[PDB]
Design a protein around this ligand. Structure first.
Ligand SMILES: Nc1nc2c(ncn2[C@@H]2O[C@H](COP(=O)(O)OP(=O)(O)OP(=O)(O)O)[C@@H](O)[C@H]2O)c(=O)[nH]1
Ligand SMILES: Nc1nc2c(ncn2[C@@H]2O[C@H](COP(=O)(O)OP(=O)(O)OP(=O)(O)O)[C@@H](O)[C@H]2O)c(=O)[nH]1
Ligand SMILES: Nc1nc2c(ncn2[C@@H]2O[C@H](COP(=O)(O)OP(=O)(O)OP(=O)(O)O)[C@@H](O)[C@H]2O)c(=O)[nH]1
Ligand SMILES: Nc1nc2c(ncn2[C@@H]2O[C@H](COP(=O)(O)OP(=O)(O)OP(=O)(O)O)[C@@H](O)[C@H]2O)c(=O)[nH]1
Ligand SMILES: [Ca+2]
Ligand SMILES: [Ca+2]
Ligand SMILES: [Ca+2]
Ligand SMILES: [Ca+2]
Ligand SMILES: [Mg+2]
Ligand SMILES: [Mg+2]
Lengths: 587, 44, 587, 44
């Protein structure tokens, strides 16, 4: 985070600026003092941020102007000390010292300043006359602590308010001219409100607020003072406390009153717990943590993520129709910086009659991002707050890594849940009829889609032997050559055309390129069986070429039925995916 | 003996550093609590 | 581990003991010095153990005798400084200072001492005359560093050898009288040898030694100097380097030469990496780490532990008969403090003809300790070195926690692998015939076991629908009342006697106590069907009382067959364990 | 200014403490390497 904090004290001769440091280190006033103190540094266990603090003194008699310019250049915060039983010091604050700090310093960045008033035990009535122009003159003075070392009046408070200038800045949050918050903090606090609200009513009740106090601040509040918080935000603004509790406007009003009364750390702890930085953006190691993937391994989501996603679906489905409208889908991605899902997703996963994403489609899209590119899935779970709403170390505890493929063929047992199938076939032979029969749509529902929004991937659940699994189909286009990623699969579904005699050439040609030599079980299916069959022009018969190579015999498929198509090919493909050593005669 | 020598006050057995540690903790129950002798920007 | 290290320097006036500390902090000799130095402390990033070090000086002119006794009482190591261009100092080392350290100190524990020789630049020939009686007199002097601050001769070496007296002791390892190691370190280094040897030949080759260097010391050795190590241990002892490499005797000889030449840290890093302490015993947080178990959850071993246990079985089966003899079972538990498995285990798990534990019995016993008491399984994997031989954080990464039971009945899907069945029946009705038919033994093999070694638990694998699972049977004895742990199950197997008319009373009585009201699927089986059946004396018929309560119809079982008994009841019990909502009519 | 004040030498930019850190590291390749001017118990 930060390296070190250096506090520099300046001022007039005979103001007792060394006496404050000596009263801090001695815990009692020393009557006779040296003219300068050493660099007394304070350890990192006094602040929960664990950042050390260096205090350095300056005297004009023992130092030089080049040394003063070097220590002013090597600083982070400057405290200017005046004595209230004097008038030359207040004149020299605006005459020299605020010009001499700003003499060499460029106007791009300025160091924050603290004003210190000493010798307040000598005067009787506490007052403030000449300082109030100077706070109206320069925008860099933010705090005007008045102290006395003889009574020990705010001696352990001055250096804390000097350190809070560096560690907890008021720069990127508050604009003092227009007197509201900056819009980056406005956008940075609407997202925290939607994560902590767990039922989407628009209000925070007493149950979610204690969760917020236990996560952010620790040791949560007494049950009486929360109504005092609710009473003061009910008094100062009309649209604050609702029937359930705080709204978004009361939350933002409480945080801007915490900004403009001076307690900066209570909102900086809130924005630093949820993952932001000093520039109000989401950090690395929160969006992108480290996960190791061995070769020939797959990623899966465990049972903890499959309750969080279900609770998100049950949170954002307001009308209880078990479907997501585009209004509720826009409400789902308001915590995201950009919309992750395009119009391609609605043709990939299962849907209802109108064209809305259903329950199993919402699970199957999340069981598709994790299989292909796992870093996008750990990025997408970080926006919703997986590590916050479920108390875990990071986003990487949701993904489990399964066994190797070769050990699973060696020991003849598999524990996996997701299986990839590759569809290789000739163009214009109804491959997309096969990939849209897994989703339950016939040809009359296939005809009313646009070619501009077209998918190559499909995924749906398949029940075999009472057990629920996931089947994924990929359409490999006709290319005349295949790369390595088009070889990696578990089964393939080679499709031929019964109307075209040429087609059983090409797929069998693909079966002679890279697929017979590896031990991959494979299936041959026949498409458009509703049309009249014509005899193929290949040398060996397709049934004979199938039965020669130890294959299961070829099935039949048509998508011209009036109702939903039969799910019988995909059950056999999943069954061959689980048990590659079980030949269909051995079953 | 040069000026490259850090002098460290220990934390334990100190009252002012304990006061620093207790004001350093963030809690939302400071919405009532005043403090004398400091004026900040926009103070009410 | 440790709090702090305090080094105290004593000696005569005008020996330059302050000049060593000033030459350490100034990195150059100061010609004029103050008579005393302050408590200059050295931070924790100079030693990998991360323990700070305090150096304190003493002078007789500025201090007092009570202050000297208090600082000698508040110390850990004392360095006594003599000047070689003097003879009064060597006299005062044995006259006062070694008596004055030992004046108040009890004889139970002594602080270690370092002897320092200064002013060696004045003399010409380095020699050692009068010190060699004193090392032969007191056993506490261990190091005799001679130094000079003018040439900077071993100034950064004296305080390291003083700190190594506290952090890396020679006390519990080496006995200087008999000149061998203590037997706790002898037993503490035989166990490290067997874990690092991964093929049980009795030797360490070049492959395992690089694994040992990479785990223990980091940045492993060059490929040329390992033959120099092997050459010097081949020279100094005859039974050292074998054909493959180092044996146990060469390993112990290398470690005792590292002890008696002074490099104590190389063996302390080895015994501290594998889990031991300063008292040479295994520590907590290594044997007993923390794992949280939610209520109504079960423990399982993942796929990483099911390769480590298989590699242990393939390591310790020398004759390759796929069975463990009691000689190889005694060789397996030589790294254990006590023998974990009694004679009860051979009647619990599967065995061969002679009575030896087989492959699946060795896996099934490890899938029984983890289900019942998980802390004993994380203790037992810590002796074999699961965290060392597979680079992981602890022993708790091998155990995974499954879903709740109630969510699994709610969503009608289970992902578990281990199922518990309870056997409730009348005494002398062949319950142990049922629990020893899962293991494949008939009545003729049942008759040749002793009643003193008798089991109540059984576990074996059951294949259903091509998938391998574990079935566990528990025999609940006749008690007339059942506790809570005898209610917790997945299925039960209520057995009745066809020879005794009373028996179908009692089991059905148990079915009216605590088991009908909960949604637990249950099975009724008939025993000793080889004998002649007699009509039961209950009011309703057993088939009618079975068919009234929505139950599957009662099976038949006899163990009087000549061959192995049929595994058909247990497949049905596992099938009812997986699918409690599937009634046998719904299948 | 009392005697309860720790004076800390920093690690960085020091040669003797770097020598302390380099002799502090454990490595098994010190079976050849001598060192002058120290005699230990049982030294050969
Ligand atoms: N009543 C009262 N007297 C104070 C207070 N602080 C300092 N003094 C007295 O004012 C005198 C002058 O303060 P010094 O600390 O000596 O002045 P200085 O800060 O060292 O200024 P330089 O000479 O420029 O280094 C001290 O001797 C103190 O006795 C205070 O808070 N209250
Ligand atoms: N009679 C009949 N025609 C079908 C049937 N299935 C698909 N067709 C027609 O055959 C054509 C081929 O379907 P496509 O899915 O477009 O073929 P493709 O090989 O996947 O190539 P793409 O155009 O990229 O999708 C479609 O335009 C349909 O009109 C069927 O079951 N019966
Ligand atoms: N040649 C040589 N001279 C040394 C060495 N160490 C110290 N001296 C000189 O010996 C003188 C006496 O040493 P001191 O450090 O002053 O004596 P002391 O340790 O303070 O002893 P006390 O008076 O009891 O506190 C110093 O002034 C050094 O100049 C050394 O290693 N080599
Ligand atoms: N004829 C015949 N006798 C059997 C058969 N099975 C068991 N028996 C006899 O019935 C007796 C009952 O067997 P046990 O296993 O001892 O009965 P239990 O109810 O489990 O009670 P325990 O003594 O604690 O084991 C045995 O002593 C056998 O001799 C069988 O299949 N046929
Ligand atoms: Ca709410
Ligand atoms: Ca809806
Ligand atoms: Ca070996
Ligand atoms: Ca054997
Ligand atoms: Mg001063
Ligand atoms: Mg001295």
């Amino acid at each position: 985070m930060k390296k070190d904090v250096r506090i520099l004290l300046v001022g007039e001769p005979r103001v007792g600026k060394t006496s404050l440091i000596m009263s801090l280190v001695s815990e009692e006033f020393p009557e006779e003092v040296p003219p300068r103190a050493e660099e007394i540094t304070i350890p990192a266990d006094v602040t929960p941020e664990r950042v050390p603090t260096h205090i350095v003194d300056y005297s004009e008699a023992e130092q030089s102007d080049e040394q003063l310019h070097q220590e002013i250049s090597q600083a982070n915060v400057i405290c200017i000390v005046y004595a209230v039983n004097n008038k030359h010091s207040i004149d020299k604050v605006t005459s020299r010292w605020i010009p001499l700090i700003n003499e060499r310093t460029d106007k791009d960045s300025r160091l924050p300043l603290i004003l210190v008033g000493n010798k307040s035990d000598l005067v009787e009535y506490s007052s403030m006359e000449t300082i109030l122009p100077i706070m109206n003159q320069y925008t860099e003075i933010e705090t005007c602590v008045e102290c006395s070392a003889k009574n020990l009046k705010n001696i352990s408070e001055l250096f804390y308010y000097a350190q809070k200038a560096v560690l907890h800045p008021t720069g990127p949050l508050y604009c003092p001219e227009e007197k509201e918050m900056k819009p980056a903090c406005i956008k940075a606090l609407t997202r925290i409100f939607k994560i902590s609200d767990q039922d989407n009513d628009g209000t925070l009740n007493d149950a979610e607020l204690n969760f917020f106090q236990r996560i952010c601040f620790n040791t949560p509040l007494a049950p009486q003072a929360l109504e005092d918080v609710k009473n003061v935000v009910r008094k100062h603004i009309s649209d604050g406390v609702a029937d359930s509790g705080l709204t978004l406007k009361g939350f933002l009003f409480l945080h801007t009153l915490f900004i403009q009364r001076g307690r900066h750390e209570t909102t900086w702890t809130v924005l630093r717990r949820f993952g932001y930085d000093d520039d109000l953006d989401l950090t690395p190691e929160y969006l992108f943590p480290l996960l190791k993937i061995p070769p020939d391994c797959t990623t899966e989501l465990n049972h903890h993520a499959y309750l969080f996603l279900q609770s998100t679906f049950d949170k954002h489905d307001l009308d209880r129709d078990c479907a997501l409208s585009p209004d509720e889908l826009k409400d789902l991605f308001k915590v995201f910086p950009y919309i992750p899902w395009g119009p391609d997703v609605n043709n990939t996963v299962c849907t209802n009659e109108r064209g809305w994403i259903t329950y199993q489609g919402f699970l199957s899209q999340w069981t598709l991002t994790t299989y292909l590119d796992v870093q996008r899935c750990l990025e997408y779970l970080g926006y919703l707050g997986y590590s916050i709403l479920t108390e875990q170390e990071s986003q990487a505890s949701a993904v489990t890594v399964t066994r190797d493929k070769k050990i699973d063929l060696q020991k003849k047992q598999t524990q996996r849940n997701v299986f990839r199938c590759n569809v290789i076939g000739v163009k214009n032979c109804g491959k997309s009829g096969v990939l849209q029969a897994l989703l339950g749509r016939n040809l009359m529902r296939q005809k009313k889609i646009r070619e501009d929004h077209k998918s190559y991937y499909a995924i749906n659940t398949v029940y075999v032997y009472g057990q629920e699994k996931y089947l994924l189909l990929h359409d490999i286009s006709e290319s005349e050559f295949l790369t390595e990623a088009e070889i990696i699969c578990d089964v393939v579904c080679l499709v031929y055309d019964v109307s075209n005699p040429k087609s059983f050439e090409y797929c069998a040609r693909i079966f002679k390129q890279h697929f017979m030599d590896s031990r991959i079980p494979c299936l041959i299916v026949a498409a458009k069986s509703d049309l009249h069959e014509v005899k193929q022009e290949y040398s060996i018969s397709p049934t004979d070429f199938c039965r020669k190579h130890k294959m299961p015999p070829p099935q039949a498929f048509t998508c011209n039925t009036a109702d939903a198509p039969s799910k019988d090919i995909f059950v056999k493909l999943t069954t061959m995916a689980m048990y590659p050593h079980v030949t269909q005669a051995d079953l | 003996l040069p000026e490259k020598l850090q002098i460290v006050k220990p934390l334990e057995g100190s009252a002012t550093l304990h006061h620093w540690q207790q004001l350093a903790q963030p809690h939302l129950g400071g919405i009532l609590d005043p403090r004398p002798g400091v004026v900040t920007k926009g103070f009410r």
